[PDB]
RNA sequence: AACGCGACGAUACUACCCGCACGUUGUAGACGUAUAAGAAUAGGCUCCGGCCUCGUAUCCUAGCAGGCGAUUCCUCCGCCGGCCUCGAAGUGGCCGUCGGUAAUUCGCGUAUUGCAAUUUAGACACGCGCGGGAUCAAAUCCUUUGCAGACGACUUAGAUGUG
RNA sequence: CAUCGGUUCUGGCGGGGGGAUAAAGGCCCAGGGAAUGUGGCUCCUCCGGGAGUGUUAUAGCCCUGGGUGUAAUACCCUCGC
């Protein structure tokens, strides 16, 4: 348990309902949550089941006027996750609206979240929750098949972001190597009494 | 080379073995013995 | 699609400057007067960097084009301005073309 | 019942190279290289002996044990493909209108294209594009015969299936109208 | 069904003028406690020997503890269970360290596989398979195999449920 | 079928109070009726049910039959 | 009748587009482009070559 | 016929395998009950590493690199103790990196307020030395 | 100069009142203390006093900052959430607002 | 989308920008509110030696809420300027100046808030002030138009003109 | 804040009793036995390991009786701090 200013969560490899439940509980407790890469979220079960559920959702509409009151079907994966979270929050109250004001959802990783730490939720991770051999699908694939238009744009922006991250990781590896060499070289100039004192303390 | 004719014409298929996932648990001699006490008991 | 920037010409006609006004006859007609000084200051460095920004960041290039309404018999003096897409070539070719 | 340990065995010929990393099998031979991703099946690969590959499943069900047989046959098919290859001989027959079959190689794709004309007098030109790695020739030994050859059995057989399914007789009695292209022989190139 | 213990329950009919020394009947009962053990004892007596609790008494109740709880054993259980079709024999095998552990495993097994409750199961005999050759079921035969050693693929790591967020993606290899 | 692309009207699992009460009433009436039919049943019933016996896969069935035989001979000798 | 959305009609139209109308439209586009070519041709920070910055939020305010 | 295979090499539960439990103690597998439970005994003379003979679920345990060679299946506490002392399981466990991490964790948990202040000051002095070394290294290249 | 902090309290969040499914009881609040995740850790903070610090509009007696005072009464549930009783019930608008758990009265 | 967003033009004032000078100004709630690989999970990471349950980690962390003066060190931080760089809702790198700075040690001051009483201390937005720098705009009514029209609304035109 | 009274929640510690005077188990003593057969011996090999023999050897295990022993510990009950 720890309180943070804002928690950024990589949505890749997470199960939709479990991540939504944890995020809704954190928002109502008072923590600001940002979720990125909602296109890479997972849903358990084989893809045609999720597709059929989305088409059953698309069936529902106000008969007398489709411009008011009806289910407005948002096709973006971030908005699918937002609908999942909003179903678990008393959104028609002032407290629920304030709790929903503490959430931001995106597709891909826009700046400045590209240079921020992205945490994961092990209670919602697909590789830790699903039994091996069980089928799963991708919310981005579902969105593309139900009418989301920007799958290719997000993919291009993601590959540019990962190229820049590869350059950053190369510099990071160089810095880590130089730091290890600096520690090894400075181990001679450090006072030995300080050395076994820190070793006895555990540092 | 293969001397026989496979019925579906897939001549590259290997000589398959019986699907026996419980193979090797019980020896043959013990099974013969257990057949003998089974017959006597019946 | 999102408009990153636009670049205008140094001289705009009165009939296209009329489009930016509702009371052009009472106007001081100051439109684009400070913009026209950007062509003269620093040999158009701001115009050049906006052109380079369109060259290196953008994928769709459209010209802005207006009609010469004074050659028509219409009593309207305020011209019509629209965006026309440049199709074909690379983005640098589109920018140089415009 | 959950079986503690189950295992299958694949021998490898001496001139064949097998590389397995993250369940992505690459099999190289005299005729070339084939590659298949098998990461949808839970299996542990090992080298139990020189020239022998072992496949094992731990604590799997009967279905998971049975999947290893499919993996074994698939890898053996790639081995046979890179060693001896796969060859499908097809025959095209007709009653009145001769079937004109043109075989060409598209340069920018690298794939072969088979054009079929005059199928029961039709004016349309049917065009079938082969899978990459499938080579099609018109046989000179026998009459009205195509020969499809390659390393990938799935590619060769799917190309032959496409050639059959493009020349389908519609709205006619099939006991009377016998024109078409049919796979007549399946085997190895070597 | 529950933390069970095995009880020796000996009971008898109340002595009368005609029968001054009535016969003693002994059963081994698996029960959570002695009240349940005596209740099952009188239920089986009313089912078998027509001796009711009103005209009977309990001579002795003792606990039969396991002789070697630290030795791994194979147990064969012969049971009858009641379904809507009727009463069926079953023989099952359990690899445990005590008879009570085998009986609770049997109860959980019957609840899982046939939806049978405690009241519908009659444990007719629990025996220890003296030899490896006495094992009949393949799911015990594969465990009693020579040189049994196996890995544990895809082990989900234990993370406390109070730690909501993790900074690294977990591994499933140890 | 075209279920995935074009699903139909969903079948509701939400029960209604009227139907739940009706189902409970009919279940109770059926249970009372089958008690009445079992009471007025003319179908023949045996006094003693057929015991299934000892399963063959029990490893000590022959020994158990040995104590059965020995106990019956002992009872015959005592009587 | 075959509808406008029919796959065979789409393939017929694709063959027409590739083999018949395509070269004609390409030649027309070439001529029009040539005419409009005739009309059209008729430090880094201090020079603008280095693209510097011009002279609702995605984050929480901090 | 040369074959390159890159796969996962798990540690295997087997007789003689030493398990580390959740309380930090050690045990050795004597008999395997099933795929989820084993029979394990820790005869170590160290009270921190000792474990009574009994059933250990494999979920509640971890696998150490240490394997006792030729430990007989079903061996009682005397034989397991003889094998443990002959093989020197305690020294090898102390050599492993899990025990070093656990020792560091205990040392950090046992610090008092004065100890934490001294840790901060000595770490700042060592940090001064390491900062000079890193500046020298970055100056070169 | 020194660049350390000056915090001597523990952060907490006001989750809710004591409640059933429907009925709530403002006289008792539920507090989530940071780093406290079970009853064993919650037992340390019993009897510790807790401040809800907020801001008002008017400046009264030299400040615009008001405090509601309370104490931690008992653990709640299994996950280290504690029950707290204050001089006045906390505002319902403050569900999720931060509170300060001080280390006094100390038993160390 | 009339409570979604972008680019551009001209922006008179008490309008705009810069500096500091503060708010009985506000905000679902600062108190170290520090931390970017990607990818796989029947496999990965590496400095190529080895390493991988584990963030129970790493950084930062002492001084009147943190003074003054030294001893000592060339370490860390910050504002600016230059050159580059960063378009998914645009900001970081290097160099240079200037300022601050216990890694070591010491000297003078702390009291009296009286045995606790939020530790009034942060960020953003808004407002009122000066002292400076920069700029002199539009819309509507009205008349008119008929590409429009129930009324509003809309297309036009009204400043010297191809009116 | 300290010292108390009433009610109540929660943590730890020191003893007593019972059972098969727990059952186990450690170390000894005396018998008996087997294999998922240790060592040894024989035969095959891909030289990695398999097959056969049999009763402790260069591992051990199971069963019965006895001692330590009124052993420890679990569980249940109970006296207090």
From TrEMBL, chain A:
* GO cellular component labels: cytosolic large ribosomal subunit
Keyword Zinc in the entry? The reply is no
Entry-linked CDD domains: Ribosomal_L13
A Pfam family matched in the record: Ribosomal_L13
Read off the PROSITE patterns from this record.
Answer: RIBOSOMAL_L13
What terms describe the molecular function in GO for this protein? mRNA binding; structural constituent of ribosome
Q: Under which name does UniProt file this protein?
A: 60S ribosomal protein L16-like protein
Organism classification = Eukaryota, Fungi, Dikarya, Ascomycota, Pezizomycotina
UniProtKB/TrEMBL annotation, chain B:
Query: What protein is this chain from?
Result: rRNA-processing protein
Superkingdom of the source species: Eukaryota
Function recorded in the entry? Involved in nucleolar integrity and required for processing of the pre-rRNA for the 60S ribosome subunit.
Compartments, as annotated in UniProt? Nucleus, Nucleolus
Q: Which residues of the full protein are shown?
A: 21 to 62 of 123
The family assignment reads: Belongs to the CGR1 family.
From TrEMBL, chain F:
At the top level of its lineage, which domain of life is listed?
Answer: Eukaryota
Q: Which organism is it from?
A: Chaetomium thermophilum (strain DSM 1495 / CBS 144.50 / IMI 039719)
Region annotation (Disordered) maps to 1-57
> Where is the sequence biased in composition, kind Basic and acidic residues?
40-52
Q: According to the UniProt entry, which residue ranges have a biased composition of type Basic residues? A: 6-39
Location(s), subcellular? Nucleus
Shown portion of the complete protein runs from 2 to 80 of 558
Name assigned to this protein: Putative GTP binding protein
Automatic annotation (TrEMBL), chain I:
What are the alphabetically sorted keywords of the record?
Answer: Ribonucleoprotein, Ribosomal protein
Top-level taxonomic group:
Eukaryota
Q: Any keyword Ribosomal protein?
A: yes
Q: Name one GO molecular function term.
A: structural constituent of ribosome
Q: Which Pfam families match?
A: Ribosomal_L35Ae
Which GO BP terms, alphabetically? translation
Q: Name one GO cellular component term.
A: ribonucleoprotein complex
What family is reported? Answer: Belongs to the eukaryotic ribosomal protein eL33 family.
The protein depicted here goes by the name 60S ribosomal protein l33-like protein
Per the UniProt record, the source organism is: Chaetomium thermophilum (strain DSM 1495 / CBS 144.50 / IMI 039719) (Thermochaetoides thermophila)
